[PDB]
Structures are given as C-alpha cells and as structure tokens.
Amino acid sequence: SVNIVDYSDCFEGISGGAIFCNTKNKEYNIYNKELIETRRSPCSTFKIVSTLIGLEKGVINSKESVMGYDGTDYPNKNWNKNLSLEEAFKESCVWYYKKLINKVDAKSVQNILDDLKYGNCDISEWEGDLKNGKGHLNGFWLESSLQISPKEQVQTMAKIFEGDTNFKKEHINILRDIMAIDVNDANINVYGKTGTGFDEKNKRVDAWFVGMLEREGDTYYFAIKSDDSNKEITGPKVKEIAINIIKKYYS
Ligand SMILES: *C(=O)N1C[C@H](NOS(=O)(=O)O)CC[C@H]1C(N)=O
Numbered sequence: 001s002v003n004i005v006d007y008s009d010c011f012e013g014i015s016g017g018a019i020f021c022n023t024k025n026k027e028y029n030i031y032n033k034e035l036i037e038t039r040r041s042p043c044s045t046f047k048i049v050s051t052l053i054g055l056e057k058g059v060i061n062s063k064e065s066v067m068g069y070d071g072t073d074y075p076n077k078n079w080n081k082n083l084s085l086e087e088a089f090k091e092s093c094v095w096y097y098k099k100l101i102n103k104v105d106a107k108s109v110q111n112i113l114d115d116l117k118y119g120n121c122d123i124s125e126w127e128g129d130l131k132n133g134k135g136h137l138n139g140f141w142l143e144s145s146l147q148i149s150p151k152e153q154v155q156t157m158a159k160i161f162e163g164d165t166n167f168k169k170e171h172i173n174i175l176r177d178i179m180a181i182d183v184n185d186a187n188i189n190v191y192g193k194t195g196t197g198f199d200e201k202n203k204r205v206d207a208w209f210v211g212m213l214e215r216e217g218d219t220y221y222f223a224i225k226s227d228d229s230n231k232e233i234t235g236p237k238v239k240e241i242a243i244n245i246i247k248k249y250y251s
C-alpha cells in the first residue's frame, strides 16, 4: 500500500523527497515520488555498502579494524590518525574507505552491486570525478559513475538488514552498531548515514540521509534526499529534516 504523503512542513522550504517503507506490513510512504525514483550519486551513503564489502573480503574484520594510516596531512583533525572502522564511518573518513575499496578487485565489487541491485551498478569511473582536482579523495561513488535512487536505497537497506543477502550476520551486526545514532528518544532506534555532493551538471546538491528506524516491533527503511540548488544544504542538514519527520510522523 503506497501512500503519497506531504512532509513539506519538515523540509522548511528545501527541495527534496522522502520514502519510508515497512516491509512487514508492506506500507510505503512517499513524499515527492518523482524525486524518490530519480537516480543520483550516493556519495558517502555508499560507506554502508563499502563497509560490508570490506568485511566480506576480509580487508577489515571488526569495528576496531584499522587501515594503516600513513601520516598524510588532512584538515579534519580526526582523519590524521590510525582510526578504527567505527570512527572512520562516523567521521565519514574518505581516505580510509578509499584505501579499503582499492584493496578489492573490480569484478567482486561489480558482482556484489549486481546482487544488491545497487542502482545502475556502474563502477566504470573507478577512480571517480578527477576533474574536481581532489585526486585520491575521489571514487566511483562520489559524484561519478555510480547512481542510485532513494527508492533503490531503501530496497537495498531492507534486503541487507532483513537478512535477505548472503552477507554474514556478524558483519550486518557490525554495520548496525556503527550506524546507530542518538536522537534523544529511547522509544525508537535510528540508524543511518549522511552523504553530501554537488551535481555540477544540474547545479544541484545531492544531500542524503539513508537508514532505518525501529519502533516497537515495526521497522521502517528510509531515504531522505534533497536536490536543492542552495549549496548550503548538506547531508547533515537533511539528517536533521529526517529526524524531524521521524519524530513527528513515526513516533
Ligand atoms: C560523503 O558524502 N562525503 C565524505 C564526507 N562526509 O560528508 S557527509 O557528512 O555528508 O557524510 C565529506 C563530503 C562528502 C564528499 N563529497 O566527499
């Protein structure tokens, strides 16, 4: 049962869409259907899947696992250390996940994305959008060849966390641990990841918050996405919109 809904009051004037789906009672709530079906770069939301790839291939093993920091200077304080999987995920540390993915052969990544139906599954621009000048701080998942819609994000999240993939339960639980967020409401468990990019072609942001909500037996998989032309709209801003929607409509 697909319900078209109006969450515009929570977007406080920012252009975007939201989809919340409960796979038990098959209830899909959609705000801005056209946007929810449009494929865009996942940006840092891809760290959800990249974490599972690294765990499955043995590049990392636990939420403590390290990737061998080499001393490179970065402006984010917390990137300048041999950080663990759990801290790299929470700090959205690009060098950690770039080094992780570059230890995996392209055919393995292709087959996993194909199995997950991860959007267009297009990893052809492996090294990413090099024309932005950021060099090694780039990859196929960051405003580059790989694109996925908010609906497809929710479908992927649901397949993973309902246990319908071949990923190990141990590895799923590590991901659950590191994605948990504190929304100052103990009656719901929220998990998610932000992402931020700028679509230079269309001059619009790609700002994301993707994840899941558990509340008293029911689970909702969700994706909130802005395509606003205002460059101040970031992943963290869209997460704030997402939490307001959760608190108002899913409590
Ligand atoms: C991922 O989207 N990115 C890595 C890092 N995290 O940003 S987030 O808070 O939106 O997750 C900085 C920006 C972005 C990128 N383009 O590298």
Ligand SMILES: NC(=O)[C@@H]1CC[C@@H]2CN1C(=O)N2OS(=O)(=O)O
Residues within 6 Å of the ligand: 181, 182, 183, 184, 185, 243
């Ligand atoms: N980024 C978060 O996790 C958000 C932002 C602030 C706190 C924790 N959280 C909330 O939902 N908060 O708001 S609060 O309930 O009004 O205190």
